């Protein structure tokens, strides 16, 4: 996937029988449940950015984040690809609380609200839930339509 890309993070708190999602309240993807995350800033590592965004959006801190995936997004007409680094943790510190950006809620693993999530999630979530590492690519036309996609399992994220 050639071209300048912009680094983002996505963090899924995934425990044995539940997963934490945030309802995005403003900005990009508002009105959909997602993992926690954002742009990676100058002067922080990708993992530092993931932690930062988890704290900003949910108040939670974490001992260890694990790399579980990479998803590259093309938005038709937008020059930069989005290079999203996906992370998982089971253990968390604190109780999740609402932020300006996100309203947190736990979901049982058989009640994941896919119809109110970004449409790409239904493709790669099953791999996340199976503990399989993956590389994904999705080309979107606007916010609702996937024109192209690829998805595979990887041994190294
Ligand atoms: C298009 O399909 C997509 N599907 C999913 N599941 N997540 C996506 C996504 N596009 C972007 N993100 C994620 C990355 C970031 O966590 C956040 C954006 O950063 P903020 O604008 O909220 O600061 O949204």
Residue numbers in the entry: 0 to 156
Lines from the paper:
In order to study the binding mode of O6-methyl-dGTP and explain the high activity of MTH1 with O6-methyl-dGTP co-crystals of both human and zebrafish MTH1 with O6-methyl-dGTP were produced. The structure of human MTH1 with O6-methyl-dGMP, the hydrolysis product, was solved at a resolution of 1.80 Å, while the structure of zfMTH1 with O6-methyl-dGMP was solved at 0.99 Å resolution. Within 6 Å of the methylated position, there are a large number of hydrophobic residues, namely F27, F72, F74, M81, W117, P118 (human) or A118 (zebrafish) and F139. When comparing the structure of human MTH1 with O6-methyl-dGMP bound with the previously solved structure of human MTH1 with 8-oxo-dGMP bound, there is a 1.1 Å shift in the position of the guanine base, which brings the methylated part of the guanine closer to the hydrophobic pocket. The RMSD value for backbone Cα-atoms comparing the two structures, using PDBeFOLD is as low as 0.20 Å showing that the protein backbone does not change when having these two different ligands in the active site. We sought to provide an explanation to the high activity of MTH1 with O6-methyl-dGTP by analysing the structures of both human and zebrafish MTH1 in complex with O6-methyl-dGMP. O6-methyl-dGMP was found to be clearly bound to both human and zebrafish MTH1 as seen from the electron density in Figure 5A and B. Given the shift of 1.1 Å in position of the base of O6-methyl-guanine compared to when 8-oxo-dGMP is bound to MTH1, it is likely that the methylation of O6 is strengthening the binding of the base to the hydrophobic pocket. The structures are highly similar as shown by RMSD values, and the main difference is the position of the methylated base. The structural analysis reveals differences in the hydrogen bonding network when human MTH1 binds 8-oxo-dGMP and O6-methyl-dGMP as shown in Figure 5C. Interestingly, when binding O6-methyl-dGMP Asp119 needs to be protonated but when binding 8-oxo-dGMP it seems as if either Asp119 or Asp120 could be protonated and in the MTH1 structure with 8-oxo-dGTP bound Asp119 is protonated.
MutT homologue 1 (MTH1) belongs to the NUDIX protein family and is known to be responsible for removal of oxidized purine nucleoside triphosphates from the nucleotide pool. We show that MutT homologue 1 (MTH1) efficiently catalyzes the hydrolysis of O6-methyl-dGTP with a catalytic efficiency similar to that for 8-oxo-dGTP. O6-methyl-dGTP activity is exclusive to MTH1 among human NUDIX proteins and conserved through evolution but not found in bacterial MutT. We present a high resolution crystal structure of human and zebrafish MTH1 in complex with O6-methyl-dGMP.
